[PDB]
Design an enzyme around this catalytic site. Sequence first.
Site, PDB file in Angstrom:
ATOM      1  N   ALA A 171      49.880  40.720  46.876  1.00  0.00           N
ATOM      2  CA  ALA A 171      48.966  40.889  45.751  1.00  0.00           C
ATOM      3  C   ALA A 171      49.347  39.999  44.578  1.00  0.00           C
ATOM      4  CB  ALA A 171      48.935  42.354  45.313  1.00  0.00           C
ATOM      5  N   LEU A 230      47.654  37.088  45.219  1.00  0.00           N
ATOM      6  CA  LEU A 230      46.233  37.285  45.487  1.00  0.00           C
ATOM      7  C   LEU A 230      45.401  37.225  44.211  1.00  0.00           C
ATOM      8  CD1 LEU A 230      44.965  39.650  48.229  1.00  0.00           C
ATOM      9  CD2 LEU A 230      43.621  39.402  46.137  1.00  0.00           C
ATOM     10  N   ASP A 231      45.866  37.868  43.142  1.00  0.00           N
ATOM     11  CA  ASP A 231      45.052  38.078  41.953  1.00  0.00           C
ATOM     12  C   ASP A 231      45.440  37.183  40.783  1.00  0.00           C
ATOM     13  OD1 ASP A 231      47.472  39.203  41.251  1.00  0.00           O
ATOM     14  OD2 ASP A 231      46.668  41.179  40.753  1.00  0.00           O
ATOM     15  N   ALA A 232      46.317  36.199  40.994  1.00  0.00           N
ATOM     16  CA  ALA A 232      46.785  35.376  39.882  1.00  0.00           C
ATOM     17  C   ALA A 232      45.641  34.593  39.246  1.00  0.00           C
ATOM     18  CB  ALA A 232      47.886  34.432  40.361  1.00  0.00           C
TER      19      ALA A 232
END
Lengths: 286, 83, 83, 83, 83, 83, 83, 83, 83, 83, 83, 47, 47
Positions: free
Chosen positions: B56, B59-61
């Site tokens: 994650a 994933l969300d950077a």
Amino acid sequence: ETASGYIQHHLQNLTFGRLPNGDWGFAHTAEQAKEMGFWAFHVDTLGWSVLLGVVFLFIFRLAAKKATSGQPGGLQNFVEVMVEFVDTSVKDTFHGRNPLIAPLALTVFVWIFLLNLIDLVPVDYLPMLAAKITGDEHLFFRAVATTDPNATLGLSISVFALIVFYSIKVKGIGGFLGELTLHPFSSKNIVVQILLIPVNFLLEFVTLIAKPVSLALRLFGNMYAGELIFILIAVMFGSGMFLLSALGVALNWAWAVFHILIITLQAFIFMMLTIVYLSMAHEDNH
Amino acid sequence: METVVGLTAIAVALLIGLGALGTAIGFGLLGGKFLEGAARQPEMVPMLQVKMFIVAGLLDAVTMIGVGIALFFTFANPFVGQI
Amino acid sequence: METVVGLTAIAVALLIGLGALGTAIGFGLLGGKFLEGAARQPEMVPMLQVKMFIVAGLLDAVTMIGVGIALFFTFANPFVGQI
Amino acid sequence: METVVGLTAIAVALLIGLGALGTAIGFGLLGGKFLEGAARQPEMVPMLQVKMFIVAGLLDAVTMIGVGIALFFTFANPFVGQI
Amino acid sequence: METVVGLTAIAVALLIGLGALGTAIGFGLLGGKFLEGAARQPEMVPMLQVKMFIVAGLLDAVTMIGVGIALFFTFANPFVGQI
Amino acid sequence: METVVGLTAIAVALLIGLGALGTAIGFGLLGGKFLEGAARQPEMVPMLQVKMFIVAGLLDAVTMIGVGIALFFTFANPFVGQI
Amino acid sequence: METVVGLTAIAVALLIGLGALGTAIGFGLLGGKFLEGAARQPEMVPMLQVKMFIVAGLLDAVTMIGVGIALFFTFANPFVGQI
Amino acid sequence: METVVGLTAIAVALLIGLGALGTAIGFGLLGGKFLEGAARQPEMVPMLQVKMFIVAGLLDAVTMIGVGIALFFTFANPFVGQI
Amino acid sequence: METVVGLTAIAVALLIGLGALGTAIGFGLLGGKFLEGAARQPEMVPMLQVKMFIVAGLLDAVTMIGVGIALFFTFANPFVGQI
Amino acid sequence: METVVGLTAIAVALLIGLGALGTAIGFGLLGGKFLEGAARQPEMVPMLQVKMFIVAGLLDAVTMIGVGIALFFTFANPFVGQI
Amino acid sequence: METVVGLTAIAVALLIGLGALGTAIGFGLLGGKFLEGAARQPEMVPMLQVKMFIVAGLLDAVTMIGVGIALFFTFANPFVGQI
Amino acid sequence: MNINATLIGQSVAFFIFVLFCMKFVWPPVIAALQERQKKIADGLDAA
Amino acid sequence: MNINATLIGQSVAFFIFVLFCMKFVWPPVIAALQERQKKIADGLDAA
């Protein structure tokens, strides 16, 4: 009064800052609060957070100063259950000898849960009690501290600072810069390893910056959305009709039933993410 | 000034929506595969846990960067200054 | 002038949103497959993760360039001076 | 004049964003199966990896053309002189 | 004049971007199964590889046609001749 | 001023719709995988359930952020004050 | 005729881009399974390939028609004759 | 005023359509795995039904909010009151 | 009448392109599954192929209807006469 | 008055198209999984089909609501009455 | 009448294209799964086929309705009567 | 919405709370739990 | 209308939610706590 004005009043905080003449006073209008610079304080958020933290610390100290070590009492059994849960959560991710991870995780979890629990109370009960007590008909007062992005941003900043401090303590500036620029891509050749530093630096810096931002913004957005839905449900009762207030009441029941679970889940997610991020500081996963 | 602000609103909307859709799809897939792996290996549930707790992070950077720039465009405007 | 600025803002938003969506989907798929592989072979986790990083850069590099250009389009504007 | 520049900026944004999205999705899909194959046969990692690299070329070549064309539009715009 | 040039620029951008996205997705999907097959049968990689090349012949034909049309529009725009 | 309000409404619609689509897709995938895991062995139904709830904590973060921002835009309006 | 020509150019671009995207996705999906079948059973490669060709026309025919339409809209224009 | 009404109608359309598309995709994905689990384990049908109902409860969370906002926008207009 | 013809051109383009994309994706999936089935059961190839043709009968009906509608809107125009 | 009616028509078209796309995708996935389950367990077909119908009851709710709202827009348009 | 008819043409195109894309994807998936099921057990073809036909109805009905709406917007036009 | 100095003071209080939990809450509870576990083990070692 | 009308609905909803939590949420937690206490007491008695 109109619904839009009610929403705007409920969306404003109590601000204390540098007035145009004297650094002692409370803002009376939203534009006046926007006039205040970075050196301003939200009195309600800090007060509620401090009060809840003090209450939690006192309650946990009551069951810790007189530990029986044998048959547990009612409060100390609950305290021990939460302590055991926190220890089990910590031991499943962190294998080191750091004595700070478990107490920090417990404090974060309980403090966040307490800060979120206050949102369950009716949206107008506490703001209207403060106004009566003070005597003003336009006082601003937001009880839910987690809807203020400043609290979540401060928590994420402190978590990030702790992560950086621990990584430095365990790796020196040497391993810190090596992980930041020389990992995960490495090459024996000097020219190739020199040319490979931009991608590694970009990836590591982007992830490191994005961690606390997401940590704060997940909770900020979730609780802001919940509070906005509750305020809008209050406007649903604001109409005054008969057939509409019952649908509003049913929606309130459904939203509260969902929101208690959301409140528990957000605190658990924040605690688990803090534990994982702290565990990632001490070893190398590359 | 009206057109610039109106288009910045759509810009912020797209910034938030595309990132939200991407994160939701990626997290759904990651959680489903994590559940399958946990079902396959009940004794490997803890370790695999921290595993996707690393994933994650990658994933969300970009989505969080987009959300931050969208908030910066919502509460500030370097465009309205360009006239 | 205002239309150019608004379209530049829309351009930045589209760039960042598409990049975030692509990175999120790719990272979700890659993390799911890595989780499945780790669950099947716990002893191969230290090696496989490294290979995952080898993929990760290839998954992000181009997107990074895009967001960089987005930054070049926010604090700077080569389109404004071309008018 | 301003409309042409704004539409060129939108064109550059679409060019880069679609290419980045496609590259990220394709690289994630390729990397998942690459990890699966590496887990299946650890002795063929030196070979399979370079094979993946070849595929990466076919995955990126056209996209690279795109990130060239956008760079040809941001600087020294050819559409400005046409009008 | 100006609107035609801007719309043809947008047309070229869409032509390149959609083709790049499609070819990236298709090549990633092809390469994943190619790597899976090579891992399943390590001794069979000299044959399968050329087979995938044949697939590339059917994969990039329309993409090459589109990129050629986009280049022809960019450098030898025929739409400016017709108003 | 009417254009600003209309574009704000369109922005709110995009924020809610994209977030809803992403959340629905992610939750559908997660629920399907959770059902498969539960059908694999009913003895781990509760614990796995908790795990999927954990996944939810990451699945709909940006979507709730967008929903809250859209709800703030529908009634309050920071864009109107910017003229 | 300015807007007619511009929209015809946009139409040609959309046609060719959508056709290329669909063709690439379908051919990648077909080629992945073709390579898997060739790897699993080497003795069926001469037959299966032929079957793939039988699919390929059905995958491309309609798209090819669209491409032809694009040509009919590039070097010719039935819309201009309608004022 | 007319533009505001048209854009709010388009906003309602997008709100309902994206939510319906996401809900249908998620429900199909959930139902496929539910049917697979029921066929695999015929004695666990009630528990799987309860679990899929619980999952669908979370799945239809943002879609219901979007539908409610669309109904509020069709039967009332806070945007019109803002002039 | 100019805008009507310009918009009908885009209408025909979208009609052909979306149908081509859907047909290509569906036929790619169908061909991949058919190749897998033929590889699994070489003796059932004459029958299965026929079945796939039946699938095509359902796959291309709406696509052919859309292509016919696009051809009618190209070579004729009911929209010119305000109908 | 023209813009309001045109955007209402576009809104209805978007609503029905998105609903049809979502229903088609979800029902295709559900029917494919149902066919797989029936093939694996021929004697469990009478129950499984019924369960599939239950899934349909949850799959067509929002889409039917959108279709009804689109019909209400086309026949009893409420946007004209709001000036 | 110009804008209303021009947007009705786009509405019909969107309706038919989205319906065709959705039905093509759904029918491709359904046909692939049906072919897999038939290949697994040749003696269940007469039953499974009939089953898929039922699914075809659930895959087509709504889309067919949209197609009808398109026809009602081609030869007839309630929007023209609304002025 | 309004970035202010609160993000500082809040976090400062955070730190203080953490320090208290590291000094007056966790050690007594973990010591009591370990003592109870040791007593249970001693009772189980009666064989 | 407006004030004095939202309060009644909010109080009714809060009372309903409190009744629901009292009738469905508290007894499980109380039972779990009592079960843990009984297990600890049984372990101490066995020791």
